[PDB]
């Protein structure tokens, strides 16, 4: 009596491939188009925010979420994989880093914690494994900003710019041809706007794009209004209102 | 839980993980054995067809699992380590315990009970590789020789001779040796031996590991050199009995 | 208790008390002292009665054993380790040990192992282990040689048993011998202390050069 | 305790070991020696509690053994000495300890310089050109530090170590009668067996 | 239960082989390309990132390169996902070598613990093995410069000259012939760049899709010093030998 | 705070004879100075001619007997009703007694019966583990006082014959039944006028190959 | 795979097939038990000179009053045997005496019942059944001289005799008419040796046959090469002059 | 471990011919404050068994539920089950036991010491001793607590042989029972003047008398007045 399931449910096809991963792909192709710039000055992350329901709140919706302080993410696939996923990366980067080393775990070995997660879920059975790709965009103080890849076996490659979702080639570019490094994080909000009404008809609005930053600091973003101490976050959301003035920005 | 089957019976009484283990041995590279009366010839192969292997960190075919008894095999090198490793403890818990230098028998027992375990027991699968397991028993002068297969089952032979063209090697040998006269010189012992695999090698005398063990503790790695010289030999030989 | 072994031409001498008393009169003169392990192999009861009753008895057991596992006889060495490796375990939390693992291998010859519940492992020649070790080694050393016939070999080893008995509240009621031989070992006897006592004061004028 | 001197002296290390065990007036053993081969050349004597010695010496024997084989290569005394301290080092914190002091007198052949290391039972291991542990070597101390500085030979040693055992049987309270000496260096291990002034 | 709703791909074959295995090194051949070249002052190596662009960053020089030592590191060819266990693993089983005996590991010691780590995923468990081969680039003091392979079957072999990945083929029959059994780094570097150019189709041989390092002796730098050659060094290079073509 | 060691009490007494053997026990049950039971059998059958008394502290006397009932019951099922010899039950005994040590146990165990060879045989336990086989034994609180009466008129020894007394003695002989139980009598009447821990009733099982036999004896009550 | 727990319409599992179809393989093995013994014979088989023959029999003691011979798969005969040792050594130490043959079998055919997925009643850590029968004989001081057949499905019955191996049919056919119950030790060897030398193609030498026996004042003796050859010597002259 | 804080004093018994009485005060003692006054400590368990128990209350309660499960679990596979292999004296004593010997094997005791008494509807008289100590015993008259020490020899008059018990007769043996415990509320002032008393009868099942009161009252205190709070100054 209980499960005796310990069989990989992950195995060897004839040509070298693994069939889960093949499965898992194709609906991550079919998932949310998203997009990621390092603009040199910053990074800037958009990804689709999407309404259930006029009468729905997207508020509690999670396209972009905070994996670490100064670090967002955002992906195309299989959200139910990804909301899990988000939250056994904060737990690993909260407890064996934030006072062990004093600070957030840098961008590249967050990357490979993550990568971690996927493969061992690929590895062993009882279980298949994730169904997603990440854009993982970050700063990081002893690294600059930087944007990697997450692969949905958790294979990584280092991008300063790409896109993930449905019509990804085309949007890759229009962000290759109008951003070449050295540029302010505002422009490369324009230049993304752009790259997505393209990508994107039908109905297109700033209502219809979450859009976050990583690349600026407030006081408030310290979390006091006292004497410094430490640098703290970096990430901020904009609201749909902020978003619908850099649309009226040409 | 994974102690459930993975090993299953045959119709025909045998077991199919079983028969299957002894096609990746044949497949493989050779090892043979030859007894004198004074020592145990073993004979290893290692035909290097590249010449991009360097040669001294490419794996040798020899192992100490004691320091009077030596294991060879013909096989999969990966499950080779997982059983060589096991056969070592076993030789040094003896000497813990028992306060004695070890005998050959109880070794061979040890290597027989491995395998016969993953056969029986669930959720593992036998080895890839049969070995040869020689050795001399402590204050004492005459051969042993022993075979084992990842059956788990075990004999003793005179000689024996495991890998690839196992059929043509113990056909050829038992030309050349009787129990009732084996020869008593390491020098003619050895030249049969090297006889034996050069016919199977094809080009080989550096591709060939001759090691010959004698009484307690005496064993020695015969190299090219003298190798090379027996082959002109019996290029020599060839030529007196035609 | 005091219990003793020395090896000589002839093989080991083992001699041995037996006293068992409620207060100090002595209400049976046997008691448990030699545990029998094989045929060959003795293994003496002292320390902790109980450790020694079940741990002699399982070592003969696991002796057994060996013989039909690897068809060999045992060393007392090895027989001795075994003991050992399972002793220091269950130290600090009790266990009290004191045997000499006594043998007469064909495969060594006569061999002695003292063994106690520290984990000690020792080899030597001639042993009294005891209370009344230091004055029973006095009488065994003066008239002590290797080469010696078992007659007189057995009755050194009874003097310095009664020696020990006099001075030490903690043996003497009978006096227990044994002889461990190549083929195993050869009771000879309970000899009573009261006989034996008169006789042994008038003969060996040993702390009776004048009689005292 | 069990008295154990070591002195590193320029063409091999010399390690002394008591050599009988006293019962009253007499010595009922005088043929001890205490001391386990590790490797042919890296050696290990022994003092401390005397069943916790052969539990622990053969431990860490069977040990090294086993990588001996299994790499069919020999290992250095200084790779012996830090595998002995960590293994200490885990024992002081369980609940029974040994209490063994060793010294092992290594000749590192792979360097082709003589080592001696000192370990204390805690796990605090030095390397030194002459030792001593307990009580022995406030006599001893006095005589080494005055009498010897580094760079003297294998005789010097012997008449030294001679020196040290008689004022230790006459003038120290603790009796483990005399020594028996060895010899580690580059040809192995040879028991000195004169101590008539060596 | 799990009988019928589960098979058994890690039984053997009516050949003698594994499934999984045999379909492993498969995964390797399509993968990118890494090359070892031992020299007798030093390593040589070099990697083929096989597709690069302006969109992924190729500043990032350590992406099959990884140290697992300060002696010993390896190149990968293939997927970052599955070298990443054993590589946090290797670097674990290092730690444990220099704590015991305060001195490093061997290379095959640490190649031989890997393949029966390896052997493991499909000799119990039922699990799934990894999918990536790795070129040891090591010392010893016992065997000089030391140059390995092994793979997810967990046989490994001696060398000083392999490859695995894509276009193993090519560069090995090139290789061979240009081979001088005994030969310093900077020649290395020169037979290494000619075999490269003529193993990447037409003009595509850039620093920029490459990843270099090499293990030199130095004598500004401490022996065995591995350098990992980020983009600037693999240009200069490049124009030396004037390969760039 | 809490050890629930203590003591209770009573008096056994095993005699091996010529062909027979008896377990003789008191059947007075204290603790301190209150009477727990004036009759309380203190000898048992445990069945295969073993009967078998537990002397000492009762807690551990009941614990001891419900783990060897067991395996009475188990040696039997396991091995097709082949009774249980003195010998075996005495070293299933010693492991159960082993088996608690660091709950030690305070006991003077008596076994008595007939051996599977035909001779009457007696063995005593020390209380966490040994045995050994004695002729005869005397048990209990009262051991110190009916072993030197015992030692002379039974075993014969510390009594000679007035001549000498010492090349002169008197022999053994082994005794009878009526003999025994003469003896047995005579230690019990004068042992319960000095221990408060005999008295009430003497049972005295006599154990012989036509079975268990009963005897009682009366004594002393307060 | 194949199922662990699934029966056929009559009610008999697969496994237990499936378990009688290797035993069928081996190299017989024939057991009488008379009055003074059992006899306990094999046929080793095999004659080579680059074979040790002399060097391997499939006659191994238990106990110094306890020996199986087999026939079967011999691999597994080895697991058997560990199991049979520790629970025959742990009752020597707590009753002091010998284990009964019939004891020892249901012992051993406990573990016998293990194979495959695991159960709540059995948690089960093997893959397939033991593809040995065995004839362990023995001596108890209650029940004398005996011996006893046990199948690896959990069955043990207690013969006078019994032959189990490939060439079983014959041989037990042969075991009846030879059977009596005035037979003894000395004639039980002989008749041994007639039916091993009528079922062979081959000549009959002690290194293709190997004899043992059972006597109470020595326990499980093996019959040594030295004996077992006289035996065979005497056996063929005697036939040998019948023609 | 654990040494008391709440005490429960005095359960005291003895067979007649043909059953057993058993009486009991009601109390749960905080030391010398009397403060549970009804507490029961008569437990029955069925029609048969009365279950008395002295010693810490915190033991109390918990052996009070342990019974009250007992018979749940004794309707469990029939009904109507009351002498086919449940509800016997022997069977709630044995179990007991057995939970009484392991916690003081392990040294976190049950701090209790009871008394089962009840008539066997199969056979004839249950009376059996159980302490804190694992010692127990039978004998025809059996008290706890004070009871032992001084209601016992009262009992003994009457009974504490075999024969003495036929001999003993419903009157006889409920004199003594009214008799000892007149004495336990005079020199132990912890046992409460409420008390219940149970005789176990063949002839007529269970009759339990609850709260029953102590009368035939002791004033003989009056005849010693020398004063104590009578003064003129």
């Known amino acids: 009596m209980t499960d005796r399931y310990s069989f990989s449910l992950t195995t060897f096809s004839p040509s070298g491939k693994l069939g889960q991963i093949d499965y898992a792909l194709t609906a991550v192709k079919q998932g949310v188009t998203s997009l990621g710039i390092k603009a040199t000055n910053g990074v800037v992350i958009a990804t689709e925010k999407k309404s259930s329901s006029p009468l729905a709140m997207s508020e509690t919706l999670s396209k972009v979420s905070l994996l670490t302080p100064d670090i967002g993410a955002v992906y195309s696939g299989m959200g139910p994989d990804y909301r899990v996923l988000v939250d056994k990366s904060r737990k690993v980067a909260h407890t064996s880093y934030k006072r062990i080393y004093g600070e957030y775990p840098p961008t590249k070995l967050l990357v490979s914690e993550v990568a971690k997660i996927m493969q061992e879920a690929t590895q062993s059975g009882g279980v298949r494994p994730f169904g997603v790709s990440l854009l993982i965009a970050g700063h990081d103080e002893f690294n600059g900003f930087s944007l990697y890849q997450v692969d949905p076996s958790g294979s990584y490659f280092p991008w300063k710019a790409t896109a993930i979702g449905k019509g990804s080639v085309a949007a890759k570019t229009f962000l290759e041809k109008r951003w070449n490094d050295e540029l302010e994080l505002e422009d490369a909000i324009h230049i993304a706007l752009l790259t997505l009404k393209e990508s994107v008809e039908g109905e297109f609005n700033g209502d219809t794009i979450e859009l976050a930053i990583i690349g600026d600091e407030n006081p408030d973003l310290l979390g006091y209004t006292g004497i410094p101490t430490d640098k703290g976050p970096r990430f901020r959301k904009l609201t749909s209102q902020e978003i619908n003035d850099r649309l009226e920005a040409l | 839980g994974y102690d459930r089957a993975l090993s299953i019976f045959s119709p025909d009484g045998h077991i199919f993980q079983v028969e299957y283990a002894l096609e990746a041995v044949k497949r493989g590279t050779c090892a043979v054995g030859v007894k004198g009366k004074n020592c145990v010839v073993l004979g290893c192969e290692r035909r290097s067809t590249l010449k991009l292997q360097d040669t001294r960190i490419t794996p040798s075919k020899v192992s100490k699992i004691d320091s009077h008894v030596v294991l060879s095999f013909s096989g999969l090198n990966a499950d080779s380590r997982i059983l060589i490793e096991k056969a070592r403890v076993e030789a040094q818990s003896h000497r813990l315990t028992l306060e004695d230098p070890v005998t050959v028998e109880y070794l061979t027992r040890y290597v027989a009970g491995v395998q016969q375990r993953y056969t029986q027991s669930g959720g593992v699968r036998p080895f890839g590789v049969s070995t040869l397991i020689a050795g001399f028993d402590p204050r004492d002068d005459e051969p042993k020789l022993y075979q084992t297969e990842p059956s788990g089952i075990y004999s003793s032979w005179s000689a024996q001779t495991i890998g690839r063209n196992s059929k043509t090697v113990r056909e050829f040998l038992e030309k050349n040796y009787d129990r009732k006269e084996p020869p008593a010189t390491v020098e003619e012992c050895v030249k049969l031996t090297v006889r034996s695999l050069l016919e199977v090698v094809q080009t080989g005398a550096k591709n060939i590991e001759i090691t010959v063990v004698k009484p307690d503790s005496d064993i020695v790695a015969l190299s090219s050199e003298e190798i090379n010289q027996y082959v002109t030999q019996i290029e020599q030989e060839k030529q007196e009995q035609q | 208790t005091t219990t003793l072994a020395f090896r000589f031409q002839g093989g080991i001498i083992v001699a041995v008390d037996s006293r068992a008393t409620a207060g100090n009169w002595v209400a049976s003169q046997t008691v448990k002292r030699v545990i029998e392990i094989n045929p060959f192999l003795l293994g003496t009861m002292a320390g902790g009665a109980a450790d020694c009753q079940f741990w002699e008895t399982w070592l003969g057991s696991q002796c057994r054993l060996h013989e039909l596992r690897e068809k060999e006889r045992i060393s007392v060495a090895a027989a001795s380790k075994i003991l050992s490796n399972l002793v220091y375990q269950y130290k600090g939390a009790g266990l009290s040990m004191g045997t000499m693992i006594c043998g007469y291998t064909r495969k060594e010859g006569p061999t002695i192992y003292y063994v106690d519940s520290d984990g000690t492992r020792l080899k030597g020649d001639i042993f009294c282990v005891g209370s009344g070790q230091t004055f029973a080694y006095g009488v065994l050393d003066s008239n002590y040689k290797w080469d010696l016939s078992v007659e007189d070999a057995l009755y050194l080893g009874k003097r310095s048993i009664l020696a020990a008995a006099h001075r030490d509240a903690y043996s003497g009621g009978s006096v227990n011998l044994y002889h461990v031989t190549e083929d195993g070992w050869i009771y000879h006897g309970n000899h009573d202390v009261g006989e034996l006592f008169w006789k042994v004061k008038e003969e060996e004028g040993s702390f009776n050069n004048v009689i005292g | 305790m069990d008295i154990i001197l070591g002195i590193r002296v320029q063409d091999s290390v010399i390690l002394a070991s008591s050599k009988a065990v006293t019962r009253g007036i007499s010595v009922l053993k005088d043929s001890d020696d205490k001391t386990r081969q590790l490797s042919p050349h890296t050696l290990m004597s022994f003092a401390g509690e005397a069943g916790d010695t052969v539990q622990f010496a053969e431990y860490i024997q069977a040990n090294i053994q086993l990588y001996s084989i299994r790499e069919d290569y020999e290992l250095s005394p200084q790779a012996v000495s830090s595998f002995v301290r960590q293994e200490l080092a885990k024992s002081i914190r369980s609940r029974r300890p040994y209490q063994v002091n060793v010294l092992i007198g290594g000749y590192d052949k792979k360097k082709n310089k003589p080592e001696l290391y000192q370990i204390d039972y805690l796990g605090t291991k030095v390397e030194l050109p002459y030792g001593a542990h307990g009580y022995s070597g406030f006599y001893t101390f006095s005589l080494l530090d005055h009498h010897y500085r580094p760079d003297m030979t294998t005789e010097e040693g012997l008449d030294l170590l001679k020196l040290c055992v008689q004022e230790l049987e006459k003038r120290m309270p603790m009796d483990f009668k005399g020594v028996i000496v060895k010899i580690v260096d580059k040809d192995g291990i040879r028991q000195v067996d004169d101590f008539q002034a060596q | ?245 | 705070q809490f050890n629930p060691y203590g003591d209770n009490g009573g008096t056994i007494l095993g005699i091996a004879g010529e062909d027979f053997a008896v377990l003789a026990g008191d059947t007075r049950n204290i603790t301190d100075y209150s009477i727990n039971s004036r009759y309380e059998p203190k000898v048992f059958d445990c069945g295969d001619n073993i009967v078998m008394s537990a002397n000492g502290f009762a807690a551990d006397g009941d614990a001891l007997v419900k783990r060897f009932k067991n395996s009475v019951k188990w040696y039997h099922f396991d091995h097709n009703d082949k009774k249980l010899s003195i010998n075996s039950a005495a070293r299933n005994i010693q492991h159960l007694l082993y088996g608690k040590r660091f709950f030690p146990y305070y006991v003077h165990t008596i076994i008595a019966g007939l051996d599977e060879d035909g001779k009457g045989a007696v063995y005593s336990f020390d209380p966490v583990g040994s045995y050994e086989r004695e002729q005869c034994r005397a048990g209990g609180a009262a051991a110190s006082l009916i072993m030197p009466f015992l030692d002379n008129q039974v075993n014969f020894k510390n009594q000679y014959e007035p001549g000498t007394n010492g090349k002169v003695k008197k022999p053994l002989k082994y005794l009878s039944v009526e003999e025994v139980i003469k003896l047995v009598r005579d230690s019990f009447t004068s042992a319960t006028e000095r221990h408060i821990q005999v008295g009430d009733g003497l049972e005295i099982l006599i154990v012989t190959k036509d079975g268990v036999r009963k005897e009682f004896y009366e004594l002393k009550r307060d | 795979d194949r199922g662990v727990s699934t029966f056929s319409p009559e009610g008999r599992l697969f496994q237990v097939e499936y378990s009688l179809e290797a035993i069928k393989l081996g190299s017989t093995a024939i057991g009488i038990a008379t009055k003074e013994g059992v006899v306990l014979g094999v046929e080793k088989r095999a004659t080579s000179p680059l074979l040790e023959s002399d060097s391997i029999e499939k006659i191994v003691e238990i106990d110094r009053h306890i020996g199986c011979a087999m026939s079967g798969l011999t691999a597994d005969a080895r697991s058997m045997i560990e199991h049979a040792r520790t629970a025959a050594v742990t009752h020597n130490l707590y009753y002091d005496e010998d284990i009964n043959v019939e004891s020892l079998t249901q012992s051993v055919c406990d573990l016998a019942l293990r194979f495959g997925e695991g159960a709540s009643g059995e948690e089960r850590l093997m893959s397939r059944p033991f593809g040995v029968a065995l004839l362990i004989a023995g001596h108890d001081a209650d029940d004398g001289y005996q011996l006893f057949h046990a199948e690896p499905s959990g069955t043990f019955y207690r013969y006078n005799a019994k032959a189990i191996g490939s060439g079983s049919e014959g041989a037990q056919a042969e075991l009846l008419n030879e059977w009596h119950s005035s037979l003894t030790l000395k004639e039980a060897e002989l008749l041994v040796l007639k039916i091993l030398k009528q079922v062979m193609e081959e000549k009959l030498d002690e290194n293709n046959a190997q004899l043992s026996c059972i006597t109470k004042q020595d326990g499980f003796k093996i019959y040594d090469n030295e004996k077992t050859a006289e035996l065979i010597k005497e056996l063929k002259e005697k036939e040998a002059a019948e023609s | 471990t654990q040494q008391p804080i709440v005490t429960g004093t005095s359960v005291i018994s003895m067979k007649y011919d043909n059953g057993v009485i058993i009486a009991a005060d009601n109390l749960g003692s905080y030391g010398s404050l009397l403060r549970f006054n009804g507490v029961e400590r008569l437990i029955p368990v069925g029609d048969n068994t009365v279950v008395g128990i002295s010693g810490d209350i915190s033991d109390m309660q918990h052996i009070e539920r342990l019974l009250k499960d007992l018979v749940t679990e004794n309707a469990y596979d029939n009904p109507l089950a009351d002498a086919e292999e449940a509800l016997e004296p022997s069977y709630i004593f044995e179990y007991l036991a057995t939970v009484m010997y392991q916690r003081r094997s392990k040294m976190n005791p049950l701090w209790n010491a009871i008394i089962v008494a009840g008539v066997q509807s199969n056979g004839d008289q249950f009376l059996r001793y159980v302490n804190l100590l694992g010692v127990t015993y039978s004998s025809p008259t059996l008290a706890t607590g004070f009871g032992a020490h001084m209601a016992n020899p009262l009992l003994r008059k009457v009974v504490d042989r075999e024969s003495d018990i036929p001999k003993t007769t419903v009157q006889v043996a409920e004199e003594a029972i009214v008799n000892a415990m007149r004495v336990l509320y005079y020199r132990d002032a912890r046992s409460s003047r409420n008390f219940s008393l149970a005789i176990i009868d063949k002839n007529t099942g269970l009759t339990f008398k609850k709260n029953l009161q102590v009368e035939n009252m002791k004033w003989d205190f009056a005849k010693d007045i020398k004063g104590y709070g009578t003064q003129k100054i």
């Open chain 5, 1 to 245: 239960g799990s009988r019928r709703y589960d098979s058994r791909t890690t039984i053997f074959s009516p050949e003698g082989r594994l499934y999984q295995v045999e379909y492993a090194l498969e995964s390797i051949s399509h993968a990118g390309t890494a090359i070892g070249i031992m020299a007798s002052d030093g390593i040589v190596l070099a990697a083929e990132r096989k597709v690069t662009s302006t969109l992924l960053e190729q500043d990032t020089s350590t992406e099959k390169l990884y140290k697992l030592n300060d002696k010993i590191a390896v190149a990968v060819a293939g997927l970052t996902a599955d070298a990443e266990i054993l590589i946090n693993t290797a670097r674990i089983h290092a730690q444990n070598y220099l704590k015991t005996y305060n001195e490093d590991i061997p290379v095959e010691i640490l190649v031989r613990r890997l393949s029966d780590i390896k052997q493991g995923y499909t000799q119990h468990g039922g699990l799934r093995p990894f999918g990536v081969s790795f070129i040891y680039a090591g010392y010893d003091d016992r065997y000089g410069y030391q140059l390995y392979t092994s793979n997810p079957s967990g046989n490994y072999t001696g060398w000083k000259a392999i490859s695995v990945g894509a276009n193993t083929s090519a560069a090995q029959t090139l290789l061979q012939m240009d081979y001088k059994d005994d030969m310093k780094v900077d020649d290395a570097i020169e037979l290494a760049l000619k075999t490269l150019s003529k193993t990447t189709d037409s003009s595509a041989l850039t620093y920029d899709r490459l990843e270099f390092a090499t293990i030199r002796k130095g004598a500004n730098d401490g022996e065995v010093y591995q350098k990992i050659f980020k983009p600037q060094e693999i240009k200069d290079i490049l124009v030396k030998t004037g390969i760039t073509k």
